[PDB]
Amino acid sequence: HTLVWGVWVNGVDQGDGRNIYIRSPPNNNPVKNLTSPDMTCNVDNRVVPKSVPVNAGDTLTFEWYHNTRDDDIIASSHHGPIAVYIAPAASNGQGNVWVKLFEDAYNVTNSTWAVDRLITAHGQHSVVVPHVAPGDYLFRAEIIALHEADSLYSQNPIRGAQFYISCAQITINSSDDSTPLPAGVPFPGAYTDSTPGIQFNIYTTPATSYVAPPPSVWSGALGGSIAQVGDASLE
Ligand SMILES: [Cu+2]
Numbered sequence: 001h002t003l004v005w006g007v008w009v010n011g012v013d014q015g016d017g018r019n020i021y022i023r024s025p026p027n028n029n030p031v032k033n034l035t036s037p038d039m040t041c042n043v044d045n046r047v048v049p050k051s052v053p054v055n056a057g058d059t060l061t062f063e064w065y066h067n068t069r070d071d072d073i074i075a076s077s078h079h080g081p082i083a084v085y086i087a088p089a090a091s092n093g094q095g096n097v098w099v100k101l102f103e104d105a106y107n108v109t110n111s112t113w114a115v116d117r118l119i120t121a122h123g124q125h126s127v128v129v130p131h132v133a134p135g136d137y138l139f140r141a142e143i144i145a146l147h148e149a150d151s152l153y154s155q156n157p158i159r160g161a162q163f164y165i166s167c168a169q170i171t172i173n174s175s176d177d178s179t180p181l182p183a184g185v186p187f188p189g190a191y192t193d194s195t196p197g198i199q200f201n202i203y204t205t206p207a208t209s210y211v212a213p214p215p216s217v218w219s220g221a222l223g224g225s226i227a228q229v230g231d232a233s234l235e
Contacts, residue, residue: 001066002028004065004166005063007052007060008126011230012230013230013235017050020050021051022168024166026044028164031164035188037188052168052169053171053173054129057128059129061125061126061230062125062141063122065123074118074143081146082142082144083142086101086138087184089135096183098190100218101127102217104125106210121227128223131175131179131220132172132180132181135172138169138170140167143163144212144213145161146202150200150202154193161200180220182220190215197213
């Protein structure tokens, strides 16, 4: 159970974005139904009044929280991967539009899941803003908690992979468009009951064998991190 509080741009806090530049849902409960319209941008997908200005090459940091800012972030039980997708905002996230900018699942070197490292990072993970066409975008941050993912939600709706989905309104101003954004995948639709990484038993199957759900990270993506960029406590 986790939500996005706001974003940082080049280590500068853009301030509380809830219902302002984040299409915030009414609470931190997960989406679990893979065919739900809620898979796009969670249960309250609508245009919110602000879009955060960035340029291509900026570091964009999402900041998550559980109940209050810079708390426990997400229950430690919620091991799983983190992904970030981008879509042109005029799509409203509909159709074959989501392009993957970031994936971090289980780190063999560190013996840690992305969620474990997200807690250590005070809820912060980042991407480099890609060199796409200037304009308005949705950045869809997705945490998949796998602690109940041994079952499919379609077989036992009390269990299943848990999707914590947050869509940020981002406006890309300066971009040379060296990597024009292609068509992407649909949400709902990209993940199905047979997709690798959706049904996974963390109690019985080693995390070294986990394969995150496709699609692959786009060739135009410039990278990211799971690391604290900014110290909320200094504010
Ligand atoms: Cu939870």
